[model samples]
Target chain A: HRVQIEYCTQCRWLPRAAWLAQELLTTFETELTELALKPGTGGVFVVRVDDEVVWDRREQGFPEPTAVKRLVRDRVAPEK
Target chain B: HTHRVQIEYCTQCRWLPRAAWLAQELLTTFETELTELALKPGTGGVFVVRVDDEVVWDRREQGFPEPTAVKRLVRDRVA
Candidate 1:
């Protein structure tokens, strides 16, 4: 099958960016030090404290501002 | 009010949101590949969609966005 990457309507811009300033705001928050995308996963990449993840406009805090809230409320808690 | 994390994906890794397989694949395989092939210097090596020199996702404590926000963290952080 052909390798194809589909991003949310918002992420469509600068598909080669690999990393966007706003989207990066959703995945690891400030816990991580660096992030990068692999060869697959739409074309976007992720660098986390442990491992990188796929880039998704839906997942990465984008035009949907609500996602940003969900990301922090769900992942970045200081206490376990 | 809340915390979060961010990741940078290169054009190649930018798949649709449903492509969980690729994300998981990269996460699992990249690390293993790095370890088995000695791709990097330490166990820290792992497969990533792309690499970002900086991270600036905005935080409650930081008070809006800071200058080094991007460089402050490489991985995404959410709470």
Candidate 2:
């Protein structure tokens, strides 16, 4: 499974994005095919798995690592 | 328990971001090899990455490290 973290560069969220990327990478590890960091405007912090939107900051508000972790895990590897 | 890497950085010196970036790099590169990554605050121009209890990179002795350099150091130990 491919995961991407699209964060707002204009808002200086790359660090937060990178940290989240680290969390996802650590948890998923071999489960994910690849994880990518995306740059965007307008406070966009979204987590997409296999090009499908799983979490949107506008709707979910700021996501905690565990919340996002479970969101991705349930979608990608529910049995694990 | 697999290897746990800790980056003890200096807060008064303001290198938490640097420490965090390196933490990200280590976690990304050694996802399978490592089980945990931590960022701890320190003092006195200290920026170090330790694989378990051993120091891999010490800023005072070897100076600041890039991912390339530290990865080599860590890979040798963890791999």
Candidate 3:
């Protein structure tokens, strides 16, 4: 599984994105194949798994950790 | 499984104390559940809390999160 978090570089959302990345990596260490951080503009913060957007801040408000985990697990480890 | 908690504070606004206080509160509340709690410096009066990639609280939109209010948000997700 590959995970990518895009955050507004100018808005200084890296801490938020970086922290999330660490959480995902820790939770799915072996299952995850890659994790990347994409710098973006216009206050955009999004999380994508395998190119599929799991969470987009612009469309919906920020998600909770449990919500993100549910989305990720459903896609990467449904049986787990 | 541990979750991630991040607090972004406006460096220009000098919210480090406020940010640290919130971090401490979250740490106390979600010690077992949190894998990491980061204090990120930002600008433009920014203060935000994100769990993993999901944003739970944003001061820009919702105003500063009260201690009790923030705790409730974290509890709902982590507990």
Candidate 4:
């Protein structure tokens, strides 16, 4: 399953946006299996998986829509 | 049989949302694969099941992000 939402402004001050995005992202996970999103999500793909965002250009790409991918392939590691 | 699930966190990124979804997905998948099996979230995002001493499924540890890690061990039990 997949979801895509658009944000015109990127502000951590809007804690609600973060919460809302988290709520929406939870729907994408399954108990025994992981979810994967296509690579063209404009960089919103991090939350698509049960993983971390090791990289972010949010501040860099603010005001511009970004694509993200949430895939099992990019899960965070202890060593990381 | 018993299975376990263990979740690792990325708190800065907070992927707990994904963990919740993973919980529901495993239950359906386990029930579908083993008609006699039952599953539930144990501690953290991990889950455990017990019918006998055998391990039927387990998300017991934070898995390496590799395709090989995702493949079920049962798939190779014969080998």
In terms of lDDT, which candidate is strongest?
2
lDDT of each residue in B12-46, candidate 4, tens digit only: 34445544344334333442233221112133544
Tens digit per residue, CA lDDT, model 1, B36-73: 11011012212222222223332333432322443233
- Can you tell me which runs of candidate 2 are displaced by over 4 Å? A1-80
Per-residue lDDT of candidate 2, residues A1-80 (tens digit): 87877777668776788788667766775576556555566788998988899999999989798888999998899855
Q: Give candidate 4 misplaced runs (Cα > 4 Å).
A: A1-80, B31-79
- Tell me the lDDT of candidate 4: 0.32
Over the true interface residues, superposed, what is the Cα RMSD of model 2?
11.1
Interface C-alpha root-mean-square deviation, candidates in order: 11.5, 11.1, 12.9, 13.8
Candidate 4, A9-80: lDDT as tens digits: 222212233343344334333432322221222343223223334323464342222233222223422111
Best TM-score among the predictions, by candidate number: 2
Q: List ranges where model 3 is wrong by over 4 Å.
A: B1-79
**3 or 4: which has the higher TM-score?**
3
Evaluate all candidate structures by whole-model CA lDDT and list the values in order. Answer: 0.30, 0.76, 0.73, 0.32
DockQ of 1: 0.04
DockQ of each: 0.04, 0.07, 0.03, 0.04
**lDDT comparing candidate 2 with the true structure:** 0.76
Query: By how many angstroms RMSD does model 3 differ from the true structure?
Result: 16.0
